[PDB]
Every structure is written in C-alpha cells, then in structure tokens.
Structure 1
Amino acid sequence: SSWSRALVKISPYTFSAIGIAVAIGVSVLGAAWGIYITGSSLIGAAIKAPRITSKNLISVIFCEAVAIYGVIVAIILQTKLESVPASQIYAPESLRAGYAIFASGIIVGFANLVCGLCVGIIGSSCALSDAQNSSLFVKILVIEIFGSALGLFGVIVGIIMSAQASWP
C-alpha cells in the first residue's frame, strides 16, 4: 500500500526524459557495434585486396543509417517535451504522456539495437563472401537492405507512439 503509493507517486517527467535519452543512447550503441562488426570484415578484405572498397562502404553507410534514424527519433522526442507545470506534475495527462514517451523511447532503442546487430552480422558475412567472389555481392547487399528494415519499422512504431504525448 504505502510502498505501492510511493511507486505510483514517482515523477513521470523523470521517466519520460530517461526513455528519451535511452532511445538515442541505445541507437548509438547498436550503430557503433554494427559499424565495428562490418569494419572488421572490411579491413580484412582490404588487406586481402583493396578492390572492393566501394562495395564494402555500403555496409558502413547502412550501419550509420541506424544512427541517423536514432538521432531523428531523439530530436522528435526532444520536440515532444513540454514545460512540466507544477500543478499538473501528477495529472493523468502528464502521467500518460510520460509513460508513452518512455515506451516509445524503449521501443526505438531496442529496435535500433536489434537492427544494428543484424546489419553488422550481415555485413561481416557479406564482406567475406565478396572477397570469396564478387559475383555474390548483389544478393548479399539485397539481403542486408532487407534486414535493415527492422530499424525503419521500429522508427515507424516509435513515431506512431510519439503522437500520444499530451503534456499540458
């Protein structure tokens, strides 16, 4: 009861800000991990032969697209912020807006992380495959592009959830 009341009495603005920051942080972390995964294979292939640098750069660009989408989502969330008035600090509208912001941020961050990991693994495999044979680069690039859609879907879901903000 008293513990439950204290839990229900937590400030929603803090949770909303935490989710907003966490979305960008997780997107950046996932993009960096995918970039490193792709870069290891790209550097190995270049050491083997520098002929496929242009083909390899596509994986890096795709990985950075996740970071770009995360940054866009973070900017949108920052735009979604309000003044947080003292009177409505515990109003139902404020609590709903904070919960929606936190949920959208968590969803965006998790989707960005998953998409970044998948893209990094796909690019790491694709660079080695291209080093084995340049004829298979087209199919590998198509597969990577198809797998990159996870981040786009997560961003779409986060944008849809962002419309729920109604902080007075």
Structure 2
Amino acid sequence: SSWSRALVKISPYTFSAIGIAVAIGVSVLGAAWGIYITGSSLIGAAIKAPRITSKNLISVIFCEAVAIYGVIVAIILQTKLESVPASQIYAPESLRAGYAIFASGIIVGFANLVCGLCVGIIGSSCALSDAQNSSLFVKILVIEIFGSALGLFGVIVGIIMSAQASWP
C-alpha cells in the first residue's frame, strides 16, 4: 500500500549519472577481460613466433577502440545531460529523461562488454590456430574485424541514443 506508492519516487539525477558512468565502467571491464584472454593466448604460443602476438595486438586494438567508444559515450553523457536544475529535479519529464539515459547506458555498456568478451574468446582461438597453421592469419583477422565491428555498432547505438533527454 504505502510502500507501493513510495517505490515510484526516485531521483533522476542519480540515474543520469549512473547511465553516464556505469556503462563506461562495464565496457572497460569487458575490454579488460578480453585483453586478459588474448594475453593468456599469446603467452601460450609465445614459444614459436610473434605473428600470434600481432594478432593479439589487433585484438588489443579492438579493445582500445571499445575503450575509446566508452570514453566518447561518457563525454556525450556529460554533454547530453539536460538542464535538470537542482531545484527542478522532481518533474516527471526529468524522470523520463533519466530513464531514457539509463536505458541508453544499459544498452551501450552491456553490448560493449558482450562484444569484448566475444572478441577475446575469438582472438584466443585465432591465436591458437595461427600458432598451429602459419597460413591461417587472414581468417583470424576476419574474426577480429567482426568483433571490432560489433563494438563499433554498439558505439553507433550509443551515438543514436545520445539524443534522448527531455528533462526541464
């Protein structure tokens, strides 16, 4: 009863800040996990030659691109913040803007982390294969480019979601 009515009320600015920051944090975490997987793969096959190291460097470049996308998302969220006056932080329009910003951050960061993990696993398998067969390098680069394209698609989704806020 009373708790049900209470649950509705929330502070939009906290949600906006969470959308600004947690998405970048989760993207960084996913990129770190992918980089760790790639580093483990490179350590496994460092015995033979550094071509697998070059492939892992391409994977790390993809992770750095994901990190740059997260940084750009954070900068946009800093810019995308509505007027949201300290006094006027209770309007339903402000709540809608906060919900939209939180949805944008959730869609961005989670997809970025999933893409980073996928890229890390694919890069590990690719480094193993490149260590196995010298010829097979372009195929590995294809999977790396696919992971980078997934990250770029997530970045584009964040860019589209940038124009969401409607707070006063």
Q: How many residues align?
A: 168
Task: Determine the C-alpha separation between the residues in 2 that align with 1:158 and 1:2.
Answer: 37
Gaps of 5+ in 2: none
Q: 1:108 to 1:122 in 2, by over 3 A?
A: same
Q: Percent identity?
A: 100
What is the CA distance between 1:54 and its match in structure 2?
3.0
Contact 1:39 1:60 in 2 (8 A): no
Contact 1:130 1:137 in 2 (8 A): yes
Deviates more, 1:34-43 or 1:4-13: 4-13
Deviates more, 1:139-148 or 1:124-133: 139-148
**Please, what TM-score do these two structures have when normalized by structure 1?**
0.91
Contact 1:94 1:166 in 2 (8 A): yes
Task: Determine the C-alpha separation between the residues in 1 that align with 2:165 and 2:83.
Answer: 13
Matches within 5 A, 1:1-168: 1-168=1-168
Task: Determine the C-alpha separation between the residues in 2 that align with 1:113 and 1:125.
Answer: 18
Contact 1:112 1:151 in 2 (8 A): yes
SS in 2 for 1:47: coil
What is the CA distance between 1:160 and its match in structure 2?
1.6
Gaps of 5+ in 1: none
Q: Deviations over 1:96-155 (max 9, x none)?
A: 110111001111110111000000001000111111112111011112211332222222
Deviates more, 1:148-157 or 1:101-110: 148-157
